[PDB]
Symmetry: C2
Subunit: 56 residues, 2 copies
């Protein structure tokens, strides 16, 4: 896959994944700081929930 | 849309909060958007920055 591994993990999670739309995957996939990214699926979900409240 | 969100420009120009945002952070934050929608005002950007900085160490 071409997504960060923790994000691919989140999308494959059968309870947490299905709610995350393709637009959100794209938004999340662009988050990086000199290649450092949220490291695991919990990190990605944590930022997703907070961003969703700002941007949805 | 502008490369640098206007609310993030406001954050960077803010004398109390602006100093904390390195140029790399500016460019990282500038890429956060959902279908062209971005965070609005300087405080919204700072709220995001604080949380994301803690996540990314």
């Amino acid at each position: 896959g071409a997504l960060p591994k923790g994000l691919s993990d989140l999308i494959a999670d059968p309870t947490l994944g299905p709610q995350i739309t393709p637009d959100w995957v794209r938004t999340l996939s662009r988050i990086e700081l000199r290649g450092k990214r949220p490291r695991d699926k919990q990190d990605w979900y944590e930022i997703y929930l907070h961003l969703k409240r700002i941007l949805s």
